[PDB]
């Protein structure tokens, strides 16, 4: 069934007035709270 | 390359910019103006 | 979702504080992906 969710909506006027890119805001939010898969690394002969 | 303060990166950028096949739409493409009588492709930059 | 939402997209803020939106430099409307093919059935509008 439907459940509560946290709705955070950016303000375009305020973001532009302060000179903050929407791409930066979205990347910060997503990487901080959901996690980002950046690249791989090789440990003990396996790409992780 | 060192004499002119250039590197292979600059050569790659120049080659990719100046050797490319560019799509540029058409003259009188749909949806056309009422009574349009001319239709012709536009030929932009082409490969060397 | 709507065309009204798209026409509200903020492009830039002028020096005098006036805001420039998508509707101010464009004309947003729902339309076909391509206006090329046009079918008619016995002289009537149609699709198939």
Degrees, nearest 5: CA angle A20-A23-A29: 90
**Contact yes or no for A12/C8 (Cβ under 8 A):** no
Helical (H) or strand (E) element with B43: strand B40-43
Picking from A9, A11, A16, A19 by the largest number of C CB atoms within 10 A of its own CB, the best residue to mutate is: A16
Would you say C34 and B30 are in contact if contact means Cβ atoms under 8 Å apart?
A: yes
Nearest Cα residue in chain C from A18: C13
How many Å apart are CA B17 and CA B48, to the nearest integer? 11
Give the DSSP H/E element, type plus range, for residue B16. helix B8-18
The H or E element that residue B22 is part of is none
Measure the CA–CA gap between B41 and B30, rounded to whole angstroms: 12
Q: Does residue B31 have a cis bond before it (omega within 30 degrees)?
A: yes
Cα distance between residue C2 and residue C6, in whole Å: 7
Instruction: Give CA–CA dist B8/B22, Å, rounded.
Output: 24
Region of A45 (left: φ > 0; alpha: ψ -120 to 50; beta: rest) is: left
* Structure token pair of residue C7: 């026409």
The Cα A18–Cα A3 span in angstroms is 34
- Please tell me the experimental approach by which this structure was elucidated: cryo-EM
């Amino acid at each position: 069934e439907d459940t509560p969710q946290f709705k955070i909506d950016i303000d375009q006027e305020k973001a532009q007035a302060l000179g903050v890119s929407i791409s930066d805001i979205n990347t910060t939010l997503g990487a901080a709270w959901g996690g980002s898969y950046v690249n791989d690394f090789i440990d003990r002969g396996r790409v992780k | 390359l060192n004499n002119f303060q250039l590197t292979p990166v600059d050569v790659i950028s120049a080659l990719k910019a100046q050797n490319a096949q560019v799509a540029a739409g058409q003259l009188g493409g749909t949806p056309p103006v009422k009574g349009q009588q001319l239709n012709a492709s536009i030929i932009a930059q082409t490969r060397l | 979702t709507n065309t009204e939402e798209f026409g509200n997209i903020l492009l830039k803020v002028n020096q005098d504080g006036s805001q420039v939106r998508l509707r101010d430099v464009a004309k947003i409307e729902l339309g076909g992906e391509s206006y090329d093919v046009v079918a008619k059935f016995n002289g009537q509008p149609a699709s198939g």
